[PDB]
Amino acid sequence: GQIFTVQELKERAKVFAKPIGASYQGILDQLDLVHQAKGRDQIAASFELNKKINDYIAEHPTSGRNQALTQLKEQVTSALGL
Amino acid sequence: GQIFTVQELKERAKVFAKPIGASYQGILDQLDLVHQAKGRDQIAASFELNKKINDYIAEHPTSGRNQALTQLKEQVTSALGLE
Ligand SMILES: [Br-]
Ligand SMILES: [Br-]
Ligand SMILES: [Cl-]
Ligand SMILES: [Cl-]
């Protein structure tokens, strides 16, 4: 219908969450590398971890869930009037 | 050492995520009420859904994960002497 069902809301949130999760996994992988490294290697790994976090925060400020919720509100607002 | 391990990061994300997940469940439950209601009951339920969404977006702008990552960044920047 006009307003998402719970299942439709969840499936929309998933679509948006998919690329964010992929980016997050790359951060996790880099974090392990930092802890497994020592000396100059650890310094290098840490700088790259910093960039990955920066890049993630810039590209993914809003969760998949929150993006879908914003769309749900508009559906509800329209179903009610404004 | 001075920065989270992957396990510690996941643990911290989960703590922050817990209240957000609870508010979200409230929205999900109210959305089911909207679809289960007929006529006048559906209108009332929709107003309350809108309020719940509105309150959530004000209360929970940043995911548990993102809150934990922001703390991680600060640890890493501190460790490397960056601002
Ligand atoms: Br997220
Ligand atoms: Br979230
Ligand atoms: Cl997400
Ligand atoms: Cl969350």
Side-chain angles (χ1 to χ4, degrees), chain B residues 11-62:
Chain B
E11 301 177 328
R12 180 56 54 81
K14 168 184 178 183
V15 172
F16 292 147
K18 193 173 284 185
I20 303 179
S23 296
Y24 185 58
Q25 192 60 53
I27 291 167
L28 294 173
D29 292 353
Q30 188 67 28
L31 181 58
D32 273 326
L33 293 182
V34 169
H35 291 291
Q36 286 163 14
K38 289 72 56 63
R40 300 300 174 193
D41 295 354
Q42 190 163 236
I43 293 167
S46 297
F47 277 99
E48 208 67 11
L49 175 59
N50 222 72
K51 179 173 170 48
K52 296 182 173 293
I53 299 167
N54 206 47
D55 292 341
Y56 172 104
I57 297 281
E59 192 175 350
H60 308 297
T62 306

Side-chain angles (χ1 to χ4, degrees), chain A residues 17 20-21 24 56 60-65, chain B residues 62-66 69:
Chain A
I20 304 175
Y24 182 59
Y56 170 100
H60 311 297
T62 302
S63 68
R65 180 194 293 175
Chain B
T62 306
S63 69
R65 175 189 297 173
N66 281 35
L69 287 174

Side-chain angles (χ1 to χ4, degrees), chain A:
Chain A
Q2 110 129 72
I3 307 173
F4 288 140
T5 62
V6 166
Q7 288 300 310
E8 295 166 342
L9 174 64
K10 290 182 178 179
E11 301 189 47
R12 183 69 63 82
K14 283 197 210 71
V15 165
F16 299 149
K18 193 175 171 173
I20 304 175
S23 293
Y24 182 59
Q25 187 64 53
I27 291 170
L28 298 186
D29 290 345
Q30 189 65 29
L31 185 57
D32 276 332
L33 293 183
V34 167
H35 288 295
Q36 291 161 8
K38 315 190 185 319
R40 301 291 171 197
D41 295 340
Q42 187 174 55
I43 292 178
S46 298
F47 270 92
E48 194 71 349
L49 176 62
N50 188 55
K51 178 180 172 300
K52 290 179 185 295
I53 301 168
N54 175 265
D55 292 347
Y56 170 100
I57 293 179
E59 164 71 285
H60 311 297
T62 302
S63 68
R65 180 194 293 175
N66 280 40
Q67 291 178 251
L69 284 175
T70 295
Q71 295 182 316
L72 176 64
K73 198 176 158 59
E74 263 312 277
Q75 300 163 357
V76 177
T77 292
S78 300
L80 284 166
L82 159 49

